[PDB]
Amino acid sequence: NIPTLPQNDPRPEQRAQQLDKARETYKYADLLPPLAFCEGVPKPDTPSAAWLVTVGKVAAAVALNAVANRRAWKFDVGGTSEEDQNEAGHNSFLARLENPSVLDEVNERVAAILGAKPNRHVPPAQNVSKDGPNGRPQSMDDYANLFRRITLPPIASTWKNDSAFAAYRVAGPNASMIQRITELPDNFAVTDAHYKQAMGEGDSLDAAKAEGRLFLADWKLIGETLVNNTYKGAQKTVYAPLALFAVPPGGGSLAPVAIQPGQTPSPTNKIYATQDGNDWLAAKSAVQVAEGNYHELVSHLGLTHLLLEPIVMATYRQLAQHHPIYMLLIPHFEGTLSINNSAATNLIAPGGAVDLIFAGTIESEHQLALAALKRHDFMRSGLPDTIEQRGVGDTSVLTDYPYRDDGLKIWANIERWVTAYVNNYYISEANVTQDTELQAWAAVLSKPFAEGGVSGFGPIDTRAALIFACTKVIFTASAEHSAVNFPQKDLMSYAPAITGAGWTAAPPSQGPLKDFQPPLELAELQAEFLYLLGGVHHTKLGFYNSNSFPYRAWFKDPKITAELLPAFQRDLAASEELIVAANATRTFKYTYMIPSTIPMSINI
Amino acid sequence: FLADWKLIGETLVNNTYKGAQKTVYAPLALFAVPPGGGSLAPVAIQPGQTPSPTNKIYATQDGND
Incomplete structure (x- = not known):
């Protein structure tokens, strides 16, 4: 079969009765309010x-790490x-039928790990458990020794270097943060002395601002929304820091200069060099805790999962099955409704892993995510658009920026494929205005943010506009999601490197570095739930298959199956x-824009 | 072969003739001779002792x- 715009369909009334039944299947509920959420899955x-x-295999290794950690403790x-x-054993052979334990333990075990729930021991076999790791640490080795049956991430032996601290702002969990500045802000009056400590006596602060070599990372949003919380009495802390960066003359890698832990200068808030x-x-280490809350809530569970949640719903409800755009996006939404459901009811839920491990109150964390979803501009949020918004565009100044460099080629691949897909089906700009389904699709996502719309989505009255809204959607369900979901395992599962809470109010050091770190009960949990979220590479961008047993090709139109999609692949x-040519010549490898690794959808 | 005028910088104070700024540096000039020997020839000059954004190497x- 060949897809068909609604004003071209030979069988129109049947199409409308499929949409009347899909809207009965996909109804709205307020599982997380101000947001357009699905009623269950x-x-x-x-x-x-x-x-x-x-997922069952990764979760099985996670439980074994808990049991093996329980053998060492006592x-x-x-x-x-x-x-x-x-x-x-069930997953390897009983599930090998493919044609019981799958929907049971796997889904049940993900919830206990994501819900921070205790007794992660055995499904159907039924303070803090002082038979497993708990409490304050004896030595820094205890964090590295929590990684028994899961392998310790490499950042543990390198996070203290200043070169690795800058690798997080170009190749870390949140690599969209830095913005080029031509002057300094008023709340961050760094001196030429601090600059020379970081760059040498042969460079100048006033020259770096001139040649476009300064880069600021401002976490001002963290101070406007987050309220600290006490875990079992003990206070957790988070700041709103400003951290300057620069590059050596002639263009090179990024390097840190100064850090101001708070937004406003004071005696209790001074620049550290x-x-x-x-x-x-x-x-x-203070700045990294700010990144831990900002990435997890604004960049990863904010500007991907929940940004695409209304776009997923409007597609099932306004676009028909025989609509070609439904044929383009639905496989890029595979499982998105399910993981955002396990997210809202377990992860970002009261008593979940985000409630304990991260410094804020659980309801202040929701305000953080909703604050960024409200400030977004969907129409001006393309990757090449933001790269020149932030002035990080010059490859001869900031030469080492794997997210930008690797990410723009993937963006160009997606838009080339979205263009030929749109241009093959929409042969005129009148095909867009007469697409009554697309205009309902556009009109519902164009509602204000309070109603449940995607902020800044309008207007999609042009073939060009449909191309962007489809490139952005595909990019933020695949590449952009990989660039933030998988760094969780590789860069965030080790707490001293980065974690959600500071356990001493320490931008000024007050003693041992084992007192700033989280309790071992949570550190084991932070590792176990970030190893599970960032360690599942299922479905692969470029290959449109189904979600049922055959997993046979989704596209049926011959022009796509044998001509257009093969060119895209x-x-x-x-x-x-x-990209592998770049990764070989890179010390800090960036494997999140590699096509063979990128997933089609947001599914973990 | 290196010619270094460091002594100029550690002693002299730039004055003014009828208001106009007269200036003098403490340069460093690098010279080389071709393979097998020959006459001296300039390679590069750094007009100031301490390298900086204002003081570069000229070729x-x-x-x-």
Whole structure:
């Protein structure tokens, strides 16, 4: 079959009766208010067994790490050891049928890990558990020794370097943060002395601002929304820092200069420079906790999961199955409704892993996410658009920026494919205005943010506008999601490197570095839920398949199946070679824009 | 072969003749001779002792500078 715009369909009334039944399947609920959320997970959008089987293995290693950590701390833990092996035995052969344990344990185990819930031991086998790691640490080795059956991430042996602290602002969880400045802000009056400590006596602050070599990262949003909370009495802290960066003359890698932990200068809030020893390291470790809340809530669970939640709904409800755009986006939404449901009811839920490990009150964290969703401009949020918004565009100044460099080739691949897909189906700008389904699609996403609309979405009255709204949507369900979901495992699962809470009010150092760090009960949990979220690479951008057992090709129109989509897939494999060419010549590898790794959808 | 006028910087104070700023630097000039020997020939000049944004190294292909 060949897709058809609604004003071209040979069988119109049947199409409208499919849409009347889809709107009965996809109804709105306020699972998280001010937002357009789905009422549970409709049966079609259940996770596929392939997803469950893939997730079950990672979650099985997570439970074993808990049991193996329970062996070290202080026959029971040998019994729970083989039962978790038994579920892996079920997944390897019982689920090998593909044609019981899948929807049971896998979904159940994800909830206990994401919900921070205790007794993550064995499904159907039924203070803090002082038979597992808990409380304040004896030594810094205890954090590295929580990684028994899961492998310790590499950043643990490198996070203290200043070169790695800058690698997070170009190749870390939130690599969209820095913005080029021509002057300094008034709340960050750094001196030429601090600049020379970071750059040498051969460079000048006033020259870096001239040659466009300054880059500021401002967490002002963190101070406007977050309210600290006490875990089992103990206070957790988060700041609203400003951290300057620069590049050496002639263009090179990024490097830190100064850190001001707060927004306003004061005696209790002074600039810390690169030569200040343990106070400097604290300032970075403080800045990293700000990134932990900002990335998790604004960049990852804010500007991907919940930004696409209304776009997923409007597509199922205004676009028909025989509509070609529904044929383009629905596979890029595979499982999005399910993971945002397990997110809202477990993760960002009271008593969840975000409630404990992160410094804010759980309801102040929601205000943080909703604040960025409200300030977005969907029409002006393309990657090449933001790159010149932030002045980070010059590749001869800021030469090492893997997110920008690797990410723009993937964006160019998506828009090339979205263009030929739109231009093959829309042969005139009148095809856009007469697409009554697309205008209902556009009119509902164009509602103000209070109603449930995507902020700044309008107007989609042009073939060009449809191309962008489809490129952005595909990019933020695939590349942009990989660039923020998988750094969780590789860069965020080790708490001293970065975590959600500071456990001393320490931009000024006050003693041991083991007192700033989270309790071992949470540090084991932070690792276990960030290893599970960032360690599942299921479905692959460029290959449109189904979510049912055959997993047979989704596209049916021959022009796509044998001509257009094959060209798009080659465009990725060509970009994959050039990106590995860059990754070989890079010390800090960036594997999140590699096509063979990028997922089609937001599914974890 | 290096010619370094460091002593100029550690002693002299720039004055003014009828208001106009007379200036003098403490340069460093690098010279080399071709392989097998020959006459001296300039390679580069750094007009100031301490390198800085204002004090750069100038080469033979830099035209009027």
